[PDB]
Design an enzyme around this catalytic site. Structure first.
Site, PDB file in Angstrom:
ATOM      1  N   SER C 138      54.089   7.409  48.609  1.00 28.12           N
ATOM      2  CA  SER C 138      54.607   8.788  48.464  1.00 28.12           C
ATOM      3  C   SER C 138      55.767   8.948  49.418  1.00 28.12           C
ATOM      4  O   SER C 138      55.889   8.202  50.401  1.00 28.12           O
ATOM      5  CB  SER C 138      53.488   9.783  48.845  1.00 28.12           C
ATOM      6  OG  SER C 138      53.950  11.128  48.987  1.00 28.12           O
ATOM      7  N   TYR C 151      46.290  13.934  52.769  1.00 32.58           N
ATOM      8  CA  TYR C 151      47.154  13.209  51.855  1.00 32.58           C
ATOM      9  C   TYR C 151      48.225  12.451  52.636  1.00 32.58           C
ATOM     10  O   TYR C 151      48.447  11.271  52.384  1.00 32.58           O
ATOM     11  CB  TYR C 151      47.781  14.202  50.865  1.00 32.58           C
ATOM     12  CG  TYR C 151      48.644  13.543  49.811  1.00 32.58           C
ATOM     13  CD1 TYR C 151      48.051  13.107  48.628  1.00 32.58           C
ATOM     14  CD2 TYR C 151      50.026  13.360  49.989  1.00 32.58           C
ATOM     15  CE1 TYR C 151      48.809  12.502  47.612  1.00 32.58           C
ATOM     16  CE2 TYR C 151      50.799  12.740  48.967  1.00 32.58           C
ATOM     17  CZ  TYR C 151      50.161  12.358  47.785  1.00 32.58           C
ATOM     18  OH  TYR C 151      50.951  11.742  46.804  1.00 32.58           O
TER      19      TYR C 151
HETATM   20  N1  LIG Z   1      54.005  12.627  40.474  1.00 33.32           N
HETATM   21  C1  LIG Z   1      54.494  12.633  41.722  1.00 33.32           C
HETATM   22  O1  LIG Z   1      55.636  13.315  42.004  1.00 33.32           O
HETATM   23  C2  LIG Z   1      53.918  11.857  42.846  1.00 33.32           C
HETATM   24  C3  LIG Z   1      54.707  11.714  44.026  1.00 33.32           C
HETATM   25  C4  LIG Z   1      54.278  10.708  44.952  1.00 33.32           C
HETATM   26  C5  LIG Z   1      53.095  10.006  44.783  1.00 33.32           C
HETATM   27  N2  LIG Z   1      52.303  10.344  43.696  1.00 33.32           N
HETATM   28  C6  LIG Z   1      51.068   9.578  43.554  1.00 33.32           C
HETATM   29  O2  LIG Z   1      51.100   8.879  42.362  1.00 33.32           O
HETATM   30  C7  LIG Z   1      49.766   8.735  41.855  1.00 33.32           C
HETATM   31  C8  LIG Z   1      49.679   9.297  40.452  1.00 33.32           C
HETATM   32  O3  LIG Z   1      50.159  10.683  40.482  1.00 33.32           O
HETATM   33  P1  LIG Z   1      50.229  11.610  39.201  1.00 33.32           P
HETATM   34  O4  LIG Z   1      51.270  12.595  39.534  1.00 33.32           O
HETATM   35  O5  LIG Z   1      50.247  10.816  37.994  1.00 33.32           O
HETATM   36  O6  LIG Z   1      48.868  12.379  39.389  1.00 33.32           O
HETATM   37  P2  LIG Z   1      47.675  12.921  38.474  1.00 33.32           P
HETATM   38  O7  LIG Z   1      48.252  13.407  37.209  1.00 33.32           O
HETATM   39  O8  LIG Z   1      46.972  13.859  39.320  1.00 33.32           O
HETATM   40  O9  LIG Z   1      46.778  11.656  38.232  1.00 33.32           O
HETATM   41  C9  LIG Z   1      45.968  11.104  39.259  1.00 33.32           C
HETATM   42  C10 LIG Z   1      45.160  10.012  38.560  1.00 33.32           C
HETATM   43  O10 LIG Z   1      44.162   9.566  39.467  1.00 33.32           O
HETATM   44  C11 LIG Z   1      42.873   9.587  38.876  1.00 33.32           C
HETATM   45  N3  LIG Z   1      41.805   9.848  39.800  1.00 33.32           N
HETATM   46  C12 LIG Z   1      41.670  10.905  40.644  1.00 33.32           C
HETATM   47  N4  LIG Z   1      40.466  10.890  41.237  1.00 33.32           N
HETATM   48  C13 LIG Z   1      39.788   9.802  40.709  1.00 33.32           C
HETATM   49  C14 LIG Z   1      38.511   9.275  40.924  1.00 33.32           C
HETATM   50  N5  LIG Z   1      37.605   9.842  41.737  1.00 33.32           N
HETATM   51  N6  LIG Z   1      38.191   8.160  40.216  1.00 33.32           N
HETATM   52  C15 LIG Z   1      39.042   7.554  39.344  1.00 33.32           C
HETATM   53  N7  LIG Z   1      40.303   8.037  39.128  1.00 33.32           N
HETATM   54  C16 LIG Z   1      40.633   9.153  39.812  1.00 33.32           C
HETATM   55  C17 LIG Z   1      43.032  10.791  37.934  1.00 33.32           C
HETATM   56  O11 LIG Z   1      41.956  10.887  36.980  1.00 33.32           O
HETATM   57  P3  LIG Z   1      41.508  12.248  36.216  1.00 33.32           P
HETATM   58  O12 LIG Z   1      42.602  12.499  35.303  1.00 33.32           O
HETATM   59  O13 LIG Z   1      40.147  11.919  35.652  1.00 33.32           O
HETATM   60  O14 LIG Z   1      41.443  13.311  37.256  1.00 33.32           O
HETATM   61  C18 LIG Z   1      44.382  10.536  37.349  1.00 33.32           C
HETATM   62  O15 LIG Z   1      44.360   9.460  36.438  1.00 33.32           O
HETATM   63  C19 LIG Z   1      48.857   9.422  42.835  1.00 33.32           C
HETATM   64  O16 LIG Z   1      48.440   8.480  43.835  1.00 33.32           O
HETATM   65  C20 LIG Z   1      49.805  10.401  43.472  1.00 33.32           C
HETATM   66  O17 LIG Z   1      49.370  10.920  44.712  1.00 33.32           O
HETATM   67  C21 LIG Z   1      52.721  11.180  42.680  1.00 33.32           C
END
Ligand SMILES: NC(=O)c1ccc[n+]([C@@H]2O[C@H](COP(=O)([O-])OP(=O)(O)OC[C@H]3O[C@@H](n4cnc5c(N)ncnc54)[C@H](OP(=O)(O)O)[C@@H]3O)[C@@H](O)[C@H]2O)c1
Ligand SMILES: NC(=O)c1ccc[n+]([C@@H]2O[C@H](COP(=O)([O-])OP(=O)(O)OC[C@H]3O[C@@H](n4cnc5c(N)ncnc54)[C@H](OP(=O)(O)O)[C@@H]3O)[C@@H](O)[C@H]2O)c1
Ligand SMILES: NC(=O)c1ccc[n+]([C@@H]2O[C@H](COP(=O)([O-])OP(=O)(O)OC[C@H]3O[C@@H](n4cnc5c(N)ncnc54)[C@H](OP(=O)(O)O)[C@@H]3O)[C@@H](O)[C@H]2O)c1
Ligand SMILES: NC(=O)c1ccc[n+]([C@@H]2O[C@H](COP(=O)([O-])OP(=O)(O)OC[C@H]3O[C@@H](n4cnc5c(N)ncnc54)[C@H](OP(=O)(O)O)[C@@H]3O)[C@@H](O)[C@H]2O)c1
Lengths: 245, 246, 246, 245
Positions: C138, C151
């Site tokens: 991140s 986080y």
């Molecule tokens: N998008 C951004 O701007 C951004 C920026 C920097 C870093 N990130 C990081 O990138 C990654 C993906 O982000 P995203 O934006 O795609 O987020 P998201 O839409 O919230 O997706 C998070 C994913 O993690 C899974 N997850 C959460 N808790 C879990 C658990 N207990 N067991 C198994 N799977 C679990 C979720 O499953 P469910 O759908 O079942 O909840 C979902 O598939 C994360 O690590 C996030 O912090 C995102």
């Protein structure tokens, strides 16, 4: 008192105003003899130090010749150098001139290296310890905009701080840098006068204020003192939280 | 008008019975702070040093095996400097590293550091008081090391909390900074110094050519706890003999 | 002789039902890898996308509320690419932040990331096989943010593990790297985009002038999983529109 | 194929040997037309690309004049620039000469800025997108020893990569850098020939080997491609693990 500079003798460049003035005042209050180097007489800085009971004098030097300090250290007894003199030129990078490149590089980077070289050559020849404090910038870490020679120079200053510590730490010369945040001085006057840019800067400072030159003095005393004898090659940001945000 | 003076201030130093915590407690007391030495067992050696120097200190027994152990330590207690120094390390091949060696290191080095800082700041923020937090980080807040995954992860986490908490509290007058010591002589590093090959490899990567002393860390902690560092927020100051430059 | 081809490789992508994990799974499959989409619930949308593109993928149901849930997922399974993407975030004033919001974020974002990587590498190391790990970090592996202490601490920890594990396993042919996305459009960031003032403040700090797309993260994950990145070890590649430069 | 460079036209400086040769070969294999810029004819590089079926030609240019590329871009159609040309000078910092300062700064930093300026001026005038890939160094992050102008220059290159991304990312020019680790080329021959220094370098590389020039090509293709369109201002280390260790 591990923060005392009694017995040390410092050269502070850019000492007539801004950060250099505040650093010279702070070093003198900590007990150093301070030579206030400037391209014009540092009348106000000397007045402040005199009123405080400190010991200071002037040296007129113009780093438009980056080798201007080549003879400034021989038998002079300096063992603290603060490389604070610096300039900035602002223009869109696509039209930035060679003059605005070279003149900034000459003062901010080349003169910093050769002034430090002459200071260290004397210490090393005399078998003495000493301290270098370079003034870096937030633009040693981030890019900023419209100041390509300044950002390149200030990144270069961070690089020299590391390399010279690598070579000289075992010879008893601590080389470190301070990276001030956004401080109210002549350097930033054009930013502060631009209401939009000023607001964008302010809201990126967690402490909620522009710095004051006096905010930089304590770190310069620290890095010049025995309380920092194991600090080498560090770049300490004194920035109100900017790089955290 | 000595900007390094801590007269009138009151500090809690964790891990204060030995090593860096002991030196930091001694240095803060010499700068004029009242110092409470937090430790699992009576920090008698530390208190004896401070008493001989003419300083003002006392003990607090606390065990961060419960990472919330300090939750009630700050209410009406007057602390305005906190040094989060307690920490442990566990070494094993990462492919075999146990859950226990993960959890116990995280609990002391990262979770307890957050919750102790939370309780300290709650008291300051509730009253409108300024204060200072100094976290003890590591070279392994910047580089990886080997065989110490929970320690590197925790010390990277400490650098992250230093930045976030500065980001959130700087405008309320709470400075949150860190010191990243390099290789410093304490009882816990004697085994590295005793291993000739390991000690040689360490020294070759230190420009200064020597291990640091615990007093070198104490000096930086006094600085970051003082008015000389009032505009320093969210910084991680390496005190490392040049290690990170090399 | 396409150095970006993943033909013959087999990947596990966590968080693969949505957002970045979905895009990364789709991109790895399009590059030729067999992809197992790890998710709490059936990742049917992801599998449908891959099947329409002609790729080879299947599901694995796994819930990292147990951070050791993947301990047996790799034995004799043939995985040689792991993308640790599952993650959550919890927001509250740091002075009030709960133990639950600390623990649950650490469990998914940091502890599960370590133990899942441990099990993946155990299988490779036991057999002498090369492989690739891509951790999703991140901007808050570098800066602090506010109101998200677990986080920021966890994502700093992920950068630390990326460095340590590279340090320990690079010579055994396991590349461990990370991608630090900036602000990317996913379902989980819609609430930021919907808040006009927050969205404006974010965009002002992105030189590119736009939010990223999930496919931008997928491209970097294919690169770091490929022979084009064989000498890249312990790197944290920011894919951020310029954020960290600004 | 999001990694294809079909339709792009690249200028690679220092393209006759070392990293520049490997990058030129890699870009051409990815489909770019590649002009191999060098101060001597890049005979071997052109032979390799020809054998691979790629499309390349030469440009003779000498960056001892840091403005040497001022007219190289007008109506030339370049939309990838790889700034790889660079030199190094090794001496104790206390005796380091002005010549060894200026000549390194001219090629590694000043020429990098003005060549990039001329490349971008043409893109921006034509309303086209493009890519810049700067070759930085581990000595953009650490100090090293005995190479003050090189470390200062390479820190400066990282600074320019950030600043130029800040100014140009919204105009469709991605500016990024690769920081190679210790790679076996002419640049490092003096280190490899010194048994002690060679050993000290090797044991600080987790991968357990010096790099090869071919190890740098994939990152240059990536950063020049649509698969990196949201990557701006990044400094990607390709270093066998050095900065982790
Ligand atoms: N998008 C951004 O701007 C951004 C920026 C920097 C870093 N990130 C990081 O990138 C990654 C993906 O982000 P995203 O934006 O795609 O987020 P998201 O839409 O919230 O997706 C998070 C994913 O993690 C899974 N997850 C959460 N808790 C879990 C658990 N207990 N067991 C198994 N799977 C679990 C979720 O499953 P469910 O759908 O079942 O909840 C979902 O598939 C994360 O690590 C996030 O912090 C995102
Ligand atoms: N926010 C900030 O204020 C900020 C942030 C980061 C770093 N810095 C750095 O802090 C340092 C001090 O700047 P400042 O903020 O105090 O602003 P300033 O008022 O512009 O100070 C620059 C000082 O350098 C002197 N100087 C410039 N060119 C010189 C030359 N050719 N020969 C001798 N002296 C010369 C100036 O002399 P004159 O008074 O005669 O011009 C002045 O004393 C500079 O290196 C600057 O880059 C400032
Ligand atoms: N010395 C170095 O070179 C070095 C380098 C970088 C960072 N560090 C960090 O600096 C800090 C101090 O290091 P040191 O070398 O002085 O180490 P040390 O000698 O091992 O001391 C660690 C201190 O933490 C206390 N502590 C451990 N677990 C505790 C618990 N459950 N509850 C309460 N206190 C507990 C210890 O108490 P007991 O004595 O009762 O066990 C001891 O006071 C640590 O965070 C360390 O990781 C040290
Ligand atoms: N470990 C490493 O090898 C390493 C690590 C980090 C970064 N780098 C950087 O990688 C880049 C390429 O270096 P290398 O390792 O491939 O070593 P190299 O063989 O020394 O390559 C330098 C290239 O730059 C050219 N060059 C130098 N001065 C020039 C001038 N005045 N005008 C035009 N071209 C000029 C050289 O031409 P000639 O062949 O005619 O001399 C050669 O093509 C340099 O920027 C270097 O700093 C190298």
């Amino acid at each position: 008192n591990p923060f005392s500079l009694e017995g040390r003798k410092a050269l502070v460049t850019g000492a007539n105003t801004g950060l250099g003035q505040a650093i010279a005042v702070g070093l003198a209050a900590a007990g150093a003899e301070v030579v206030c180097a400037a391209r014009r007489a540092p009348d106000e800085t000397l007045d402040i130090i005199a009123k405080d009971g400190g010991n200071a004098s002037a040296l007129l030097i113009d780093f438009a010749d980056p080798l201007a300090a080549k003879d400034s250290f021989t038998d002079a007894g300096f063992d603290i150098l603060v490389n604070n003199a610096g300039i900035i030129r602002r223009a869109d990078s696509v039209e930035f001139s060679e003059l605005d490149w070279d003149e900034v590089m000459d003062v901010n980077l080349k003169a910093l290296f050769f002034t430090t070289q002459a200071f260290a050559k004397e210490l090393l020849a005399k078998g003495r310890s000493g301290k270098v404090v370079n003034i870096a910038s937030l633009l040693s870490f981030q890019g900023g905009i419209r100041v390509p020679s300044y950002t390149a120079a200030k990144h270069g200053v961070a690089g020299l701080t590391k390399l010279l510590a690598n070579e000289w730490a075992a010879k008893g010369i601590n080389v470190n840098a301070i990276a001030p945040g956004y401080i109210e001085t002549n350097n930033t006057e054009a930013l502060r006068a631009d209401a939009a840019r000023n607001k964008a800067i302010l809201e990126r400072i967690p402490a909620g204020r522009w710095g004051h030159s006096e905010d930089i003095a304590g770190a310069a005393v620290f890095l010049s003192s025995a309380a920092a004898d194991y600090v080498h090659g560090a770049i300490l940001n004194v920035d109100g939280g900017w790089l955290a945000r």
